[PDB]
């Protein structure tokens, strides 16, 4: 289960490189320089790194010192191999965007989120990255009448389309990814799920530019199943990209090692990444708990990547099983990939078998034997078998 | 706050029929007949009455019963002047639908699913609803491999596709209204909110003949803001139909009067529903506690509409406070309405004003006063002003 | 992992002979008869079954057709060397208990459900159980002033005390279990997690006769953690018998098999178990899905046995482990066992190096080693150790 | 509604004095002077302010500088007539917490947290103080091993036991109140709600010296009901002190101003503490949101004492109430204080009308008249009625 580079797993680099600060305390851990991030994370087998903008140039850098940050990082990354396949913008943690950043009240920090957002695109594209995310953190409101959400969104759609806009006009090859999120900071964020988020994407001028960004704590601090909503970001050809990590509950995102948090969501999220073909990056948002020095952080960090070949394994041998094959056609998960009327309504409406002489008691009574199959899936994923 | 057939109030056959049972106890109430719930909610001022087709016709009718029982029915509406303006099929009851009616693995239960809808959309169309509901409550799984999700939804759009098709083919009036609920009765039900509804609507093949029937419990379930959600169902242009009840927390649905549960999330939907101009029915999907007898189920639907007037007044005092309208530029809620960059991208990203000479926090520390608004809209609710 | 009645494994009647009637579902099984499903399980390796009086004994049954239904249970019992090591009461699925049986604010409802507790306690104690579980499904509340909660902690406490009071008068070699579960079937039920059972307790006349019986379900239900909850119960003293299952996260109660759900917490609650010796029956309170016929129904009933099993084989190599123990120590568990100031606070206070010259620097600094520790949990819990 | 020091309503110097940095947020607000917090509190009608140890002297100071805060402090309290009814001590923010303060597993960690606390417990007498807080923030996990929790309750009962024989030894006239909260900062945090703190504390060896301090958001955090955790608590004789916000549901700790979020639980709460008779302070442990400036600050604390004011005024009117009265009558909430059973276990079994003559079908048709109970609270409440 050791990771290679051909195993596609990335970071970010405010994820080994948080400090460990939260609503109740103050770091725990020194600030990581992001050229020791990308070489540590090479030697751990990482493929990539990620970044928003101030993770690698610090807030208000002039261009002298820009640069000196971007040349060092385009060093480290030269010398290690690692390639950079995703950034983005912080729009979230400066005082001005307390109120947001696309969707910000104010006509001026709406317009300047922009400005800060085409400024690390050009970045991101230069230093080779295919997706850019965009997590509207901000985008929300704590009360009902601070922000009217039917005009925000008219805000959130012009500001996408001025990015699609843009990335047309200069004719870059990169595609956005829009990371849903239920809430924190924000009382309630907007786009809040997998679906909304899809649903929003089909009204922006070019939705063939745009993607989502899910990550497995988010929805799971919506209560909702991240397995099924990634099947319906993959039905409609919208899976850009992927953010991995644990949550343990409906509760402020936790951001653990993935794996951690659900485990049996994390083995059906795996066995549908590999069995859908899903190319992109495996990347990891997370955040090694604050109670880990440095070296806990690298191992949380190695842990992230284990349990996905893990689990990859374990996915694997279950769909290979022919006990499992057996099992599956004994649920009729071949009759479910069948046209329910090919044909069409006219042959469907004639057909006495379908409702008029239908047997609906002994059809009732046809058990489904899904337990059978779930306890198969237990012991491929214990392993014991 | 004296209901009239003018507001438009309507409620399901089994909301105030509901007997009592729910997973530890049995009946409380007896059956109630529909003549005897169309005419006591007629005297109540209520505007009309809507029906799965085993509420009004008992499963497995034959046509003479079918009869017999339709035009009892008919009788007590023509009397009344109620009308019905939705109806839906009970696809979830019988023992034959424990796994689903549209996505059911089994082919036989799925065709039938279909039949058993048909047949019932030509009652609702003879009858005068324009909008038809499907809640696919069945349409989920309680473990990861017994649904394939991706194969389950082209089953689900190709049966939504063959009921637009039907529709299109007998020209009837009536379009689709999606009902997404994240769980209960299945671990995990598909499309399980608002979101995901509007982005897989966006897939079927005539997406025009098909809106969302938000439920404010239901979302709720999944922690979400209901309100926010209907700001986006609005924006899009597919709040075709809404279901109002109370729901207290993440938890079983609970199906309270409307107002109960959460109370100022009950006030920002009426404020938006009628800003926005909602035309529809205000239709209330909910569930007397069986710990009422007969009298209590009256009450408890006259409660329904009581709260929805109540809070109706709240919400337009609110909106008319001169002094409300000035919090509401003081939080600069007109300037969100204003386009971001309407002029465009060149112009933006030529503006010094804009990144290069913005004093971020100059406007950082411009306090948003969302405060001050959000206790003048307490004080309207409470009727404090 | 075959089980064996060594393993105490046991089962309600109740459980494996759950019809399938959920709020929107019609019953897809057949009622078991109990002494089949006695004979069921024997076969599968149980110790033994529990019931609710009206489980062994229809409601209403008449005073010989009670004779006969315990005589045929008794003989089933004898036949095959299955315990009846817990009974319970059902003061939830008859209506005259929808406002509650010990805390309905009906006076002779308490006294119906008092005398009804008595009855089953007599029966109880003739077949051999030592534990006696109540359940209050229908104490509490919808609405804030239906129940008056300090009254009806008056009511629960007075009813508690005269059921003590009675076995004691009877020399009734019974303990009582008390069942807590944060809502459903009322929208809040009384002494809703475990803290809350527990703390009840303390202020009854006879402390000693009462412990509590924790469900994996009810404690998930209100995000708690289960293993945390059971180690209070058991360094309290009060861990009397628990209810095994699965539930993934805040929604209604699925009763999962147990290993269902979430995995890891049965992982660390069998750790826990085995590791506090806790010597009573490991009870399953579960519902094989609706969706299974009665083969299903099996398969889910034995999943219960093997996922216990697997998973006390696997916390059994971690803890074995000479790694996971360097770990441990590495992460200071043993740190935590040795007293805080076994020296009293006089010398503690003098105790300059425990302030004035505490260094909180070094202290600070240093990592507690969590990471690689729950990562050497996670590869013994998948078999990668 | 304005207040005045006749009302008892406090505020912590860490509430208004948030300076808004949150998960992904730096600081939108300067620090504000103690003086000037006790000040501006004052002149909005406080009773007076609640500190942490570091709150009011600066972590690190030198013990002339503490001196002198300590001095400025004890001057504007003496200038505006403010009280200091409750204090507490910050184990939580600092590195050297990380893993906890009484139940970390490093013991000298244990020894500077016990030592910590009792310099706080002194300052606080002299002040004034009696009640002191303890919210163990930081007790508890991210992961199974990292504790053992049946020894971390034996390292928590150890400090609260010698902080016990602190004050004893010291004739100090003051309490403890142990703050429950389920997650945040941590995983899982140790005694995570009311109940397993009342609980805890029976295990002491001076029961007596403690009791609960309960927050509003702490037990909505798990989904509990708020006002019934606070009726078990009066009901125990253990509502030592109560910290007042609000809280939008199931998500990270929000402490919303009192009023916001779930807005009946606190009409319920207000109804509960006035009737209770109820006298300790009324707490806001609050913070104005960080889209707020200095003046929204003020706009947010003054919401908390007008809400509650409303908030009594509605709820004492709801009581008085003729209507309201017969109501609660004809829900039988009089016959719940009645006795089930006040004739002994004896007579009861000899009753032959509380089983054999009692009859369960016209107990079972009688209504509750919630419903109707209900709507006249919400009648109130909305100042309808
Ligand atoms: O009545 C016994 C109780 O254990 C059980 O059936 C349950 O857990 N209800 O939720
Ligand atoms: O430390 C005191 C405690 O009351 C407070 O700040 C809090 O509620 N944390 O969640
Ligand atoms: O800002 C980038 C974004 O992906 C971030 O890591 C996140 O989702 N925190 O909740
Ligand atoms: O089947 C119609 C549907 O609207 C139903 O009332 C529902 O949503 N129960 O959860
Ligand atoms: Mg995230
Ligand atoms: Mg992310
Ligand atoms: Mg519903
Ligand atoms: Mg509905
Ligand atoms: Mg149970
Ligand atoms: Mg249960
Ligand atoms: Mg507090
Ligand atoms: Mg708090």
Same mark, same amino acid.
């Given at each position: 289960?050791?990771?290679?580079?051909?195993?596609?797993?990335?970071?970010? &680099?405010?994820?080994?490189? =948080? @400090?460990?600060? +939260?609503?109740?305390?103050?770091?725990?851990?020194?600030?990581?320089?992001?050229?020791?991030?990308?070489?540590?994370?090479?030697?751990?087998?990482?493929?990539?790194?990620?970044?928003?903008?101030?993770? &690698?140039?610090?807030?208000?850098?002039?261009?002298?010192?820009?640069?000196?940050?971007?040349?060092?990082?385009?060093?480290?990354?030269?010398?290690?191999?690692?390639?950079?396949?995703?950034?983005?913008?912080?729009?979230?943690?400066?005082?001005?965007?307390?109120?947001?950043?696309?969707?910000?009240?104010? !006509? +001026? $920090?709406?317009?300047?989120?922009? !400005?800060?957002?085409?400024?690390?695109?050009?970045?991101?594209?230069?230093?080779?990255?295919?997706?850019?995310?965009?997590?509207?953190? /901000?985008?929300?409101?704590?009360?009902?009448?601070?922000?009217?959400?039917? $005009?925000?969104?008219? /805000?959130?759609?012009?500001?996408?389309?001025?990015?699609?806009? %843009?990335?047309?006009?200069?004719?870059?090859?990169?595609?956005?990814?829009?990371?849903?999120?239920?809430?924190?900071?924000?009382?309630?964020?907007?786009?809040?799920?997998?679906?909304?988020?899809?649903?929003?994407?089909?009204?922006?001028?070019?939705? *063939?530019?745009?993607?989502?960004?899910?990550?497995?704590?988010?929805?799971?601090?919506?209560?909702?199943?991240?397995?099924?909503?990634?099947?319906?970001?993959? =039905?409609?050809?919208?899976?850009?990209?992927?953010?991995? #990590?644990?949550?343990?509950?409906?509760? %402020?995102? @936790?951001?653990?090692?993935?794996?951690?948090?659900?485990? !049996?969501?994390?083995?059906?999220?795996?066995?549908? &990444?590999?069995?859908?073909? %899903?190319?992109?990056?495996?990347?990891?948002?997370?955040?090694?708990?604050?109670?880990?020095?440095?070296?806990?952080? =690298?191992?949380?960090?190695?842990?992230?990547?284990? #349990? %996905?070949?893990?689990?990859?394994? /374990?996915?694997?041998?279950?769909?290979?099983?022919?006990?499992? @094959?057996?099992? &599956?056609?004994?649920?009729?998960?071949?009759?479910?990939?069948?046209?329910?009327?090919?044909?069409? $309504?006219? *042959?469907?409406?004639?057909? /006495?078998?379908?409702?008029?002489?239908?047997?609906?008691?002994?059809?009732?009574?046809?058990?489904?034997?899904?337990?059978?199959?779930? @306890?198969?899936?237990?012991?491929?994923?214990?392993?014991?078998?």
């Amino acid at each position: 289960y050791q990771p290679t580079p051909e195993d596609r797993f990335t970071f970010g &680099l405010w994820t080994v490189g =948080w @400090q460990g600060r +939260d609503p109740f305390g103050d770091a725990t851990r020194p600030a990581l320089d992001p050229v020791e991030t990308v070489q540590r994370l090479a030697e751990l087998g990482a493929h990539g790194v990620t970044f928003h903008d101030d993770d &690698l140039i610090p807030f208000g850098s002039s261009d002298t010192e820009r640069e000196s940050h971007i040349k060092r990082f385009r060093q480290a990354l030269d010398a290690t191999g690692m390639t950079v396949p995703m950034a983005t913008t912080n729009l979230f943690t400066h005082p001005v965007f307390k109120d947001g950043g696309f969707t910000a009240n104010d !006509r +001026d $920090v709406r317009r300047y989120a922009l !400005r800060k957002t085409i400024r690390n695109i050009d970045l991101a594209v230069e230093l080779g990255a295919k997706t850019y995310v965009a997590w509207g953190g /901000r985008e929300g409101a704590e009360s009902g009448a601070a922000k009217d959400v039917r $005009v925000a969104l008219d /805000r959130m759609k012009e500001a996408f389309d001025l990015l699609g806009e %843009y990335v047309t006009s200069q004719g870059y090859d990169t595609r956005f990814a829009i990371e849903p999120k239920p809430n924190e900071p924000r009382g309630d964020i907007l786009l809040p799920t997998v679906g909304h988020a899809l649903a929003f994407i089909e009204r922006l001028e070019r939705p *063939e530019l745009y993607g989502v960004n899910p990550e497995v704590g988010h929805e799971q601090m919506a209560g909702l199943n991240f397995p099924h909503g990634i099947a319906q970001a993959l =039905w409609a050809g919208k899976l850009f990209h992927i953010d991995l #990590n644990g949550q343990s509950g409906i509760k %402020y995102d @936790q951001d653990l090692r993935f794996g951690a948090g659900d485990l !049996r969501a994390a083995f059906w999220l795996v066995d549908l &990444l590999e069995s859908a073909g %899903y190319e992109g990056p495996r990347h990891f948002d997370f955040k090694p708990p604050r109670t880990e020095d440095i070296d806990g952080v =690298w191992a949380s960090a190695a842990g992230c990547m284990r #349990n %996905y070949l893990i689990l990859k394994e /374990r996915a694997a041998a279950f769909r290979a099983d022919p006990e499992v @094959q057996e099992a &599956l056609r004994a649920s009729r998960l071949d009759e479910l990939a069948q046209p329910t009327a090919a044909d069409g $309504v006219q *042959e469907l409406l004639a057909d /006495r078998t379908a409702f008029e002489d239908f047997d609906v008691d002994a059809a009732a009574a046809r058990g489904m034997a899904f337990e059978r199959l779930d @306890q198969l899936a237990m012991d491929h994923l214990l392993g014991a078998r």
